[PDB]
Design a protein around this ligand. Structure first.
Ligand SMILES: C[C@@H](Oc1cc(-c2cnn(C3CCNCC3)c2)cnc1N)c1c(Cl)ccc(F)c1Cl
Length: 294
């Protein structure tokens, strides 16, 4: 059985909190991802249940185990908690903190201000989401963990409404690399040295965070509109960068462009990103900027 090391500690399958299967009830499907389903469940403690298909390979089993180990070892408010696992019954379960707001990409697209919902979201709401995820990324950075796939689709919200907290929720790329296909690489979130040399550092996540920022302030658009993966690879390698999202304040766009510096040594670490986001939240001209109404 595989081991996992995070910070200054090694953990094993035996360290996962096994929840008796009898104590777990499935309530509803949540839109089941790639390999395996996700359910809202109860243990009463409300959870999201990630399932492993009973029809899977040996490597699928180990991948599922590793994902459980990875998430169970984090301790930060902006990373989704693992309640426990049910690995001794089939299908195997990982039990996560239930984030009623769903994933960030879907939330942004569904919560875009509209003539019907005129003030569904404001600039400060967006800055608070960015700050939350940046605080999660800083925790990973200071613990030497490279996420490799920072993107809106991999972030979750505790709730739809005003008190929402954003958290990093998926660690599948990090799990794969820990031990594939070109077409499955998130190239639109990757810096030049990552997709060219396969070099990953904390500054990898900085670049990806810049792309997340664009997703957030565009309110859920796909990065590099109209461009394919190869077109983006060539665009970005040649120095090309995205334009500001519609109505994006200059101070916010400036953070994106600093995250997208060609040389990793020229990009900010997450402490600096957090400082700059906090300064944007203080600037009335930023937070008084109206978001576009679809
Ligand atoms: C594995 C799965 O986990 C969760 C999904 C959800 C979720 C998905 N959809 N919804 C809807 C529930 C009804 N209201 C709208 C959101 C909630 C909540 N908490 C989770 N821990 C998940 C998904 Cl499905 C997508 C992105 C992620 F980063 C993660 Cl980590």
């Amino acid at each position: 059985n595989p081991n996992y090391c995070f910070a200054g500690k090694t953990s094993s399958i035996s360290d996962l909190k096994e929840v008796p299967r009898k104590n777990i009830t499935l309530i509803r499907g949540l839109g089941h991802g790639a390999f395996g389903e996700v359910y809202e469940g109860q243990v009463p403690l409300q959870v999201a249940v990630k399932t492993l298909p009973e029809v899977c390979s040996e490597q699928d089993e180990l991948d599922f185990l590793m994902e459980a180990l990875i998430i169970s070892k984090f301790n930060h408010q902006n990373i989704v908690r693992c309640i426990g696992v049910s690995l001794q019954s089939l299908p195997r379960f990982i039990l996560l903190e239930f984030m009623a707001g769903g994933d960030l990409k879907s939330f942004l697209r569904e919560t875009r201000p509209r003539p019907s919902q005129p003030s569904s979201l404001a600039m400060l709401d967006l800055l608070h989401v960015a700050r939350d995820i940046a605080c999660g990324c800083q925790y990973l950075e200071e613990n030497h963990f490279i996420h490799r796939d920072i993107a809106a689709r991999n972030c979750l919200l505790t709730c739809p409404g005003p008190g929402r907290v954003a958290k990093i929720g998926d660690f599948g790329m990090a799990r794969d690399i820990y031990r594939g296909g070109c077409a499955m690489l998130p190239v639109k979130w990757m810096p030049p040295e990552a997709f060219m040399e396969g070099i990953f550092t904390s500054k990898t996540d900085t670049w990806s965070f810049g792309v997340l920022l664009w997703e957030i302030f565009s309110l859920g658009y796909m990065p590099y509109p109209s461009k394919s993966n190869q077109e983006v690879l060539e665009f970005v390698t040649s120095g090309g960068r995205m334009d500001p999202p519609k109505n994006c304040p200059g101070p916010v766009y400036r953070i994106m462009t600093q995250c997208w510096q060609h040389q990793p040594e020229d990009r900010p670490n997450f402490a600096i990103i957090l400082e700059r986001i906090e300064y944007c939240t203080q600037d009335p001209d930023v937070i008084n900027t109206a978001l576009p109404i679809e």
